[PDB]
Symmetry: C3
């Protein structure tokens, strides 16, 4: 705690005084956990928050503190003006939250997909019952029928009736169009906070356990640790699909009931099996289906917008960046000074085009063009129920998407409000898209052998 002990209470010059306090805070944050990074000019506070001020006196030094709390949300920022005893001005410090997210890493369970073919092995017996245990390869299914040999249905030289057997095993052949990962690690929070003053920026990570206490500035991250990252996730063509998705070795009818793990494809079901008769020749086997394969249901999975993927070989990290993770508590005790918080006004221009349906699976989709001069975290409101409550507008990217469920019937005008800018979006109702492949597959292929 050595850098707080230097007292810059009074200097004759005000430029030298602001340079002295800027350096004092600079080495205060630099000496401790903060790292120097490239300053972002476009981040300015949009909002003002509740503040408590005071003064603590240690030995010969008097120091004034301001204490304020901020939602732990990416893009949120607050401004502080530091003045000396009704003199003006010393320094401006902006505190944004650069990163707020929680993540988990997943392990690959299996690959799945539709069934393109069936492999079959079969044998018949003229006499005797079916084998008590039918020989089959791992993950193949067995099928057997007693009493196969009958008059006019014999093989060569076979005279028995209501006797004999026809048995075999089968396995589906599939094409991999999807991979399924399982949530292995618990969910961890990455919060990155930064300070910008005198065209310089210093950043740090934050911890729920350990507060960051510098001499001149203190942050403490408060939260409750309850996060829902879905336990089992499908990935398809680099998209993230969630829903009712089978865990490893779980064959329940639904997405992923045929699992290819390591070398071999596993599945379950009752094979559709029957034979044809010849007089003097061997019986023909008819296999219409082997595994039950409900891969079609995978098309009906939800695709969440609030997550993002990082694919590493065999393992997939999933990140939630968009949500409020708690409260950031700050106490800025810079010396003998007076504090006045600021925030600027936000200017946004916008346009929008919305299309969709009602009482349907897809509901309504909106494409917004949002131009903002400064980065702003904007709560968005609508007459209908919008999926995500807010939207973070940045001067770099101008194209933003958002979806809606209208409990009522919308017209051409669709009112949506981003911060203070109230935007009328042009909407066109399209008929609900037709439902295809909802029904299961009776017959994966027709195998006659």
């Amino acid at each position: 705690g050595g850098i707080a002990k230097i007292d810059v209470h009074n200097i004759e010059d005000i430029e030298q005084y602001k340079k002295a306090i800027t350096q004092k805070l600079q080495t205060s944050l630099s000496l401790f956990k903060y790292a120097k990074t490239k300053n972002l000019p476009h981040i300015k506070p949009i909002y003002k928050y509740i503040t408590i001020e005071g003064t603590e006196t240690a030995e010969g030094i008097e120091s004034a503190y301001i204490e304020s709390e901020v939602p732990a949300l990416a893009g949120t920022s607050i401004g502080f003006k530091i003045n000396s005893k009704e003199g003006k001005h010393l320094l401006d410090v902006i505190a944004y939250v650069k990163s707020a997210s929680y993540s988990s890493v997943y392990t690959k369970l299996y690959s799945t997909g539709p069934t393109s073919g069936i492999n079959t092995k079969h044998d018949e017996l003229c006499t005797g019952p079916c084998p008590a245990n039918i020989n089959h390869q791992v993950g193949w299914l067995t099928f057997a029928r007693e009493r196969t040999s009958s008059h006019g249905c014999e093989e060569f030289g076979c005279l028995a009736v209501s006797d004999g057997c026809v048995f075999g095993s089968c396995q589906d052949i599939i094409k991999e169009e999807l991979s399924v990962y399982r949530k292995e690690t618990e969910e961890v929070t990455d919060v990155e906070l930064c300070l910008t003053f005198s065209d310089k920026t210093y950043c740090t990570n934050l911890n729920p356990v350990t507060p960051i206490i510098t001499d001149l500035f203190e942050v403490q991250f408060k939260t409750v640790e309850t996060y829902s990252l879905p336990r089992i996730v499908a990935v398809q063509n680099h998209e993230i699909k969630i829903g009712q998705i089978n865990d490893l070795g779980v064959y329940s009818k639904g997405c992923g009931n045929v699992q290819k793990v390591n070398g071999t494809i596993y599945g379950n079901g009752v094979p559709r099996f029957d034979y044809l008769c010849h007089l003097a020749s061997r019986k023909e086997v008819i296999v219409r289906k082997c595994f039950d394969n409900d891969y079609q249901a995978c098309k009906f999975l939800q695709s969440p917008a609030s997550y993002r993927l990082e694919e590493d070989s065999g393992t997939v990290t999933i990140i939630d960046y968009k949500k409020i993770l708690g409260t950031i508590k700050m106490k800025a005790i810079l010396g003998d000074v007076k504090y006045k918080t600021f925030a600027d006004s936000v200017d946004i221009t916008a346009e929008g085009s919305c299309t969709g349906c009602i009482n349907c699976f897809e509901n309504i989709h909106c494409e917004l063009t949002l131009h903002t001069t400064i980065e702003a975290s904007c709560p968005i409101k609508s007459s209908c129920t919008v999926f995500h409550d807010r939207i973070l507008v940045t001067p770099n990217e101008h194209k933003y998407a958002l979806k809606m469920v209208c409990t009522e019937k919308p017209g051409n005008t669709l009112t949506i409000k981003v911060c203070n800018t109230k935007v009328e979006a042009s909407m066109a109702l399209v008929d609900a898209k037709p439902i295809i492949e909802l029904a299961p597959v009776d017959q994966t292929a027709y195998i006659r052998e």
Copy 2:
């Protein structure tokens, strides 16, 4: 005092009115039961000095705090009560399908004297196919058919169900509605709150603190205007359980292996015996849980679900009025109560209790029991005198079952009844008997 008390009452009144707050009738029966941690101080703006009190309160319906505002070395000037009117989170869901028990089966079948079964059986959408080879045999013919161990019988089936339940899917992310109110001189002003933007007036400031994680189930059943949750199939998912027969738009969809066999005639066409088509586990829908902490809003095709009972964060307040001194207050709560409890042990339904609770003021009451009560607290209001709550007693209770509502300690009358019989747990082998 009257001149100035009206000065602060009107001054704060238009200070709050300038912002989004709406004027509502003041309720005398809302009074604080608890006092919380406060930090006081004084901020100075130019020549005027203003004293602030800062206090934090749980974001829970029924929670309230009292403040008395005084003039320095004099008392008292004014009472302001802060009350949390609404704390809830909601989401809207889209209708996936209808389901229910299987009342009948539609079947179409065709027979062939000669040849194998068709390689592809033609069937209607969502129907299942069934086929048997080698149908024509001695004594098992149609007229003019003389073949043996040859021919075919093939067909299609679809269950016919009665719609007795509907299933919805969570479409929107989960959002929080919190509404707080202020009462002074028999006038009340209320407002909604936002996790992002604080509502800061000149004289009064509130900030809503939270983390954005909520337990709304992704898929919900609605049955006869109630909301039932459990293991319920998503759209197009046929796993055995509740909702494995889905009626979407016009046609009923299902999956399974039809129970199919034939009967023989000598000179006539063969009769088909269909005992089952779809796997229909609708009976399992009877075992869904019915959560008490939710409430429904039904719109055609879409259902909003609301959770009102839980603590969603903290409300932080800064009251900066002027040259005044602050002293927080809360009243004492008077509640009289009785209870009647019945139930079983190690059983699905456990114990249910009806309590008669009379309270003079609206109170958020933590409730305590030897047994484990489902919901940790209960909100008593002067309006309703009869309240219900359920329990799981791990051991066997006697006649006395002790329950404590706020500070009122209540003896509940308990009577053990045997567990309700378990019925229709087994699946249906045979949905119907179709012979034609």
Copy 3:
């Protein structure tokens, strides 16, 4: 004099806490604050007496503590008070649904008809499955006295016989929060439970527990050999293929499936029945359930309470107003000695397991850091237990050294890559048994 005064204030706070709900317990020597937190100080005036308060906020996490040193204006020191969070957990109680396990046998009842079709309704016991074959009487396939051809029936019922090797319970009560806080001064400790609703306001000391009420306790849980396994586990009466699709509820076993059923023909005897499978029983899948590390069980007859102790449940706000004094918060430095041994694989289900020997002089809640992704973000070291476990997912291939950081102690862990364990019993059972009768 300072002695009489520190004893006077120790007694005053002591009777403040005794006057309120706090209970006296055995002082813990090993509890000292490791971290220093943000404090706001001030003075409130009640009538003629002026009192100075310190206010500080703390995460509601088991093992967390903060220190306060109380001085007299211009003099030091009077007394030390440590605020320790003894318990932070949330719990729910569950009711037993069913027992399950692999299929050891099959019970079968069957009857035969020489003439007529199969019965429109087949008689069967509760929870048994029915099976029927038309056209049973055919050439060469008879019982004595049967005249017919392409006619008759064979019907029956079956039930699996299992060995109970697992139990499944359903969450009946909502999740409730247990937080226990303590204060230590002059070798005396006072503890209390906390409530999100009602603050605890004493004369000299005030606490308020802040939280949001959202907790992830799994709705359905398996218990096996007094361990708690979670995953995709069927709710009561739900027969979907997976763990628990054969449920033994009360007296009788219930299940679902299509029985694999056929007969053999004899000339001189009655026909023999072949049942290869009755219920679909996917109990093998139960082997693949995850076993969560952050829970612990309490078993009562027929009901299971499940507790999560390891997570952050909110913030503890404290206001210590002791009168005219000066406050200065402390925390000590943490000394930990450690060794570690890690073995495991990559791109595999089991990933990496690490056993650490962690010796600490005081109880510490340690954030742990690693190059790889460790399962649990932190670990709580206490002087009693020296062996602590933690697992990892390494996206890359580790060497011999695997560095992991417990508080400020930096640990070199010996790593050995072993091949992934072979996957066994992933495929389902076609045939639960071979029954010929």
